[PDB]
RNA sequence: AAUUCCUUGUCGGGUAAGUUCCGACCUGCACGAAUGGCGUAAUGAUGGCCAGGCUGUCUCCACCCGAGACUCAGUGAAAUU
RNA sequence: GCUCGCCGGAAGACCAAGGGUUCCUGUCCAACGUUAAUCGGGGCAGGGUGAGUCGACCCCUAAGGCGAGGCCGAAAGGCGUAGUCGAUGGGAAACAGGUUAAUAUUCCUGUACUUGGUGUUACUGCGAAGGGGGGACGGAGAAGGCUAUGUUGGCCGGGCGACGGUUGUCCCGGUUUAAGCGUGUAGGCUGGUUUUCCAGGCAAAUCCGGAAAAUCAAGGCUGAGGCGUGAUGACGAGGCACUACGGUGCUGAAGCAACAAAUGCCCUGCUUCCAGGAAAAGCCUCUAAGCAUCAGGUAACAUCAAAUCGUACCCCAAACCGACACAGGUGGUCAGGUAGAGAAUACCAAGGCGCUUGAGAGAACUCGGGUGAAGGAACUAGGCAAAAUGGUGCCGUAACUUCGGGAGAAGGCACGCUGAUAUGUAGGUGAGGUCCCUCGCGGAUGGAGCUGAAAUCAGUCGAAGAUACCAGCUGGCUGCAACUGUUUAUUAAAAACACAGCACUGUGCAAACACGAAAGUGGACGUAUACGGUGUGACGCCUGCCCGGUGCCGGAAGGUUAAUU
RNA sequence: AGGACCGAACCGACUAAUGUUGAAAAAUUAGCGGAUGACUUGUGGCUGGGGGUGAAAGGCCAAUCAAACCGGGAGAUAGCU
């Protein structure tokens, strides 16, 4: 059966990447929360 | 020409085609083409604003000259062409200076017929003049509502207007809708009727024929779960309320004209 | 009647026997003319009924070929309590 | 290692996506592997990915995104111009052979090609953020001409048979060779050439377009394949010396023809139809502003440069998505032989596998199958299931019908093999030879050789000749819906939803309407033969009476009636 | 010529059996429907929660839908266990 996760690096970065998060007020707040929490990986970039 | 196909299959019994051999069996004039991407009835917000629009055959836009401001220069008709962006056919005309343009095809226009625009033009079909110089009681098309911007009335397949009077700077017209409207006596109009009259006798014959035109199916509303439509639902076929649009408006007699800005040119609105 | 409560309505047809089916009757509990009425060739993995052919569906089960079940060796769960 | 069995339009081979060292070698067996394990996609270590031509980056844009100013909006922010990003598309160039345990159109050998920089020489009007051309485009169908490829023959080499026969019409194997350069064919499109003039192409223009004359008909463009060269080469079944039987050096014969033939090429073509079929750049041209013994431009030669990143391996799967080494899912490319209409099906080739627990036994019962006396739906809610029909050709074929259908209606007959007609026919293919010729990949004649149905007559074997796989049950009455379609992913596929058609109604364009505090956008680059909404639902015969109620559309004498005063 | 016919790929899912701590959180096997079109499919893009999309089932919107998911108000309230 076809499942939900059909990977694509392009769509992954364009939807959840660093530059996508850094392009909106609410996206920049996502990074601020993950920095304050201490996340080692902020985004799905690499 | 109107011709009825034969019932070789369900889907061809009732199809009625409009065949015109005078049309050009070739490619159109490229310099007057443009890209026309489809919308699906969606706006810049990506929301469906007009329902029942989607798909269909790819189309290229033909740049038509609705203004006809090439005064004092005769033009000869080269050929008639099919235009998918409208119901009427168009004509490729060639001027004496070597310029080519597209125009709406009047009733009895052929290849080789001469036309002309301006006030010094003759009174014959295809020519364009300001309605001030048009004899009253004549039939015209591609009428301008404001001088210089281009025709906006009587542009469909077999549509035409009739000049009924001329009081002053204005003139009165009866539109194909029966409405009696008046416009300035400086708006240009083209003599004759748009020639594709048999376009109304066309019978699609099947659903796919409408999908080719870009029309998506219409779901009524009675069987639509009142969360989606006032007509909503019911156990069986109930429909016990006044006919109403989505968003709650009658749609069975209620008038919705609320302009009030013109309110001067309308005399005999209709019926 | 995709609508008829009384109801397996009554007559007829089909069956040795037909609450279903088909055709008529009309006492339409409570059809009805674009929330359409009556017909309608063709079409339908559509509903109902009748025939020919076919058969282990059945009278009534029998045998056979294989995979498990059973035994040996190895690995080694579960619900529940 | 010898056998057996399975896939073979894949269970083979090459990729994208995705994964990210799973690749190769050595070593280890605790854990991981549904068992053991000396093995492994496991542990440890080492090694491995070589590009001017493949791809990415790069140039160009689509949908769409961002968006200087700007418009709008309590703030956040929204829309959008100029612009700038964005492939799933367009844009220059490399082929064969050989080689590593693991890479290769990337290394080596051989033979080529493309775009730029610099310089020299000769001849010169060069120049764009502009104009024009071109790029540039649909569906279906029809053949014709070709190739990939295959078969047979011939040629070369080898072989004479574990059991009767096999020196012959016998058996096995091989018979391969590219890009590029040259030739410009089958065939397709278009009439060329010179001169004069012009309200057009935001200005100009020798270019495009247009008009009027003269002059010639042969002019050009495009174009598969073939032929030649590339190639005195390479490859080559098998041999000769080494030969740790692990392989390395040398040598290496034939290397032609005919027939058949694609879904691939000519073909972005031809014909035809309506639903009428991207954009931009590169590229070819035109000149302007400007620069002219310069600079620049064309051609020849020479030289330099072509960076950077990816390249291992899996990729219908044990490596991706599914928690698993999970009977699932996953886009593109390659497409052998016999039979066959066929990419179905059966058996095979190349190649790849036997699916990571086995050994015995041969109870009930369950699962998946085979056969069945007599009867033949008596079973059951119901012929559920199963059985059965099944192919080609000819004959033949009802009611009804919208005259198309119904219809493959129903039903009936014949099908193998051998020989002859005919030492292989009709047909297809077409050599040599002869003749013509603008002598050319030419034309005509010519018919060798090759290939090869179908039919008839006769004879013959079997219980059975469409013998296997494959492969319609049929008919009669009737309800509903016209039909093809759509739907409750995961208990409902239907009489429901759509549907063409019909009707009412709204809408005169800054349209109604809709998304939006707004700007604005869609509707529509449309204009009442249009658009939106509602109901009905092909077609045919029809659609009756009622406006008191509710709503909608009008109307006005009067009454009542808000803020305000 | 055809929303034409038979029928593989491909897209679907009418019937039955199996399986139901499954091989599989909807599949397998034997049959079945469509198969030049209102077809199917790859890549990328747009529509965001009282909103979207919907040939309309209250269907779908990441195994979740008569109002998604995450976090917060929040130790909501619970005359009930």
Q: Which residues of B182-220 are buried (b: 16+ CB within 10 A; e: fewer)?
A: bbbbebbbbbbbbbbeebeebeebbeeebbeebbeeeee
> In A1-46, where does DSSP find H-type helix?
9-16, 18-21, 25-37
Determine the nucleotide nearest to B142 by Cα–C1' distance.
D527
What dihedral do alpha carbons B24, B26, B29, B34 form, nearest 10°? 110
What's the Å distance between residue B99 CA and nucleotide D202 C1'?
15
Domains of chain A, first to last: 1-46 (1.10.287.3980)
User: Which residue in B92, B84, B106 sits closest to B189, CA to CA?
Assistant: B106
Measured CA to CA, the distance from residue B204 to residue B13 in angstroms comes to 10
What's the Å distance between residue B15 CA and nucleotide E2 C1'?
12
List the structure tokens of B112.
Answer: 């080789």
Give Cα separations from A19 to A46, B190, B196 (angstroms): 13, 57, 56
Residue holding tokens 């439509």?
Answer: B229
Number of other CB atoms surrounding residue B270 within 10 Å: 10
Output the furthest CA–CA distance in chain B (Å, rounded): 72
What's the Å distance between residue B213 CA and nucleotide C55 C1'?
55
Give Cα separations from A11 to A20, A43, A46, B86, B254 (angstroms): 11, 14, 13, 39, 49
User: Which residue in B124, B157, B123, B159 sits closest to B141, CA to CA?
Assistant: B159
SS (H, E, C) chain B: CEEECCCCCCCCCCCEEECCCCECCCCCCHHHEEECCCCCCECCCCCECCCCECCCCCCEEECECCCCCCECCCEEEEEEECCCCCCCCEEEEEECCCCEEEEECECCCCCCCEECECCCCCCCCCCEEEHHHCCCCCEEECEECCCCCCEEECCCCCCCEEEEECCCCEEEEECCCCCEEEEECCCEEEECCECCHHHHHCECCCHHHHHHCCECCCCCCCCCCCCCCCCCCCCCCCCCCCCCCCCCCCCCCCCCCCCCCCCCCECCCCC
Measured CA to CA, the distance from residue B114 to residue B132 in angstroms comes to 22
What's the Å distance between residue B53 CA and nucleotide D169 C1'?
76
Measured CA to CA, the distance from residue B91 to residue B194 in angstroms comes to 11
Give me the resolution in angstroms, 1 decimal.
Answer: 2.1
Measured CA to CA, the distance from residue B125 to residue B155 in angstroms comes to 15
Determine the nucleotide nearest to B234 by Cα–C1' distance.
C35
User: Which residue in B149, B151, B152, B177 sits closest to B162, CA to CA?
Assistant: B177
What's the Å distance between residue B53 CA and nucleotide D241 C1'?
85
B10 touches strand C (CB under 7 A): yes
Determine the nucleotide nearest to B239 by Cα–C1' distance.
C35
Domains of chain B, first to last: 1-113 (2.40.50.140), 117-194 (no CATH), 195-271 (4.10.950.10)
Cβ partners under 8 Å of residue B206, min gap 6? B11, B15
List the structure tokens of B201.
Answer: 């006798």
Residue holding tokens 């490619």?
Answer: B27
Question: Is residue B234 a contact partner of residue B144, using CB atoms and an 8 Å limit?
Answer: no
B221 touches strand C (CB under 7 A): no
User: Which residue in B93, B163, B101 sits closest to B130, CA to CA?
Assistant: B163
B12 touches strand C (CB under 7 A): no
What's the Å distance between residue B107 CA and nucleotide D338 C1'?
69
Is B137 exposed, middle or buried (CB count within 10 Å of its CB: 0-12, 13-18, 19+)?
exposed
């Amino acid at each position: 059966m076809k499942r939900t996760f059909q990977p694509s690096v392009l769509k992954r970065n364009r939807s959840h990447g660093f530059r996508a998060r850094m392009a909106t007020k609410n996206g920049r707040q996502v990074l601020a929360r993950r920095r304050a929490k201490g996340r080692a990986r902020l985004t799905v970039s690499k | 020409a109107v011709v009825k196909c034969k019932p070789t299959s369900p889907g061809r019994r009732h199809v009625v085609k409009v065949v015109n051999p005078e049309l050009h069996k070739g490619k159109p004039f490229a310099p007057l083409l443009e890209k026309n991407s489809k919308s699906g009835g969606r706006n810049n917000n990506g929301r469906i604003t007009t329902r029942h629009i989607g798909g269909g055959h790819k189309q290229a836009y033909r740049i038509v000259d609705f203004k006809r401001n090439k005064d004092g220069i005769p033009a000869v008709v080269e050929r008639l062409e099919y235009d998918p962006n409208r119901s009427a056919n168009i004509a490729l005309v060639l001027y004496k200076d070597g310029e080519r343009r597209y125009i709406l095809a009047p009733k009895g226009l052929k290849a080789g017929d001469q036309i002309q625009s301006g006030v010094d033009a003759a009174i014959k079909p295809g020519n364009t003049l300001p309605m001030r110089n048009i004899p009253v009681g004549s039939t015209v098309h591609n009428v301008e509502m404001k001088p210089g911007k281009g025709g906006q009335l009587a542009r469909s397949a077999g549509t035409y207007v009739q000049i009924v009077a001329r009081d002053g700077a204005y003139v009165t017209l009866r539109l194909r809708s029966g409405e009696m409207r008046k416009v300035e006596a400086d708006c240009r109009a083209t003599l004759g009727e748009v020639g594709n009259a048999e376009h109304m006798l066309r019978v699609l014959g099947k659903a796919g024929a409408a999908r080719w035109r870009g029309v998506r199916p219409t779901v009524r509303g009675t069987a639509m779960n009142p969360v989606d439509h006032p007509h909503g639902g019911g156990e069986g076929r109930n429909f016990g309320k006044h006919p109403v649009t989505p968003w709650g408006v009658q749609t069975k007699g209620k008038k919705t004209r609320s302009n009030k800005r013109t309110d001067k040119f309308i005399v005999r609105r209709r019926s």
